[PDB]
Amino acid sequence: RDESDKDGMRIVIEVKRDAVGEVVLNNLYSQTQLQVSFGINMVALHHGQ
């Protein structure tokens, strides 16, 4: 669920009793978009080229 109320940004992800929790967070980083790779490419017009 979400619990954002203009005092931050809260997304609660409840963990089951039979689960480590840290392993779930590592899986979420690996699979989900919580970790994203920003591909830097510094191209700009210098002297109009």
Place this chain on the structure above:
DNA sequence: TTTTTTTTTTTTTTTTTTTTTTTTTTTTTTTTTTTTTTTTTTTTTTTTTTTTTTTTTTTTTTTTTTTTTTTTTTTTTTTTTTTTTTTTTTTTTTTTTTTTTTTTTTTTTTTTTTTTTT
């Protein structure tokens, strides 16, 4: 300090219902085949004076079988009633006009990541 009662969401998987992929039948649609209309010219058909020997109508009289005729009893005709179809008032619904309130989609271009197939 140990032990006892109750509460719910999950191990759930199966029954019921819903949703989503399917393909028989009457209504469209493109094709070929047969009805219509306008020109050329063409031997061919067809319109109109003259003569002619014909063959059917009008003097007159005759009869007979269709035109006179009266009457019995049928039976088509007309009357009432009711059903079926046609046709027109009535109602309903939908569309367009011009200023208002709201929205919703398809593609380029590069680079990086997921997400399936081999």
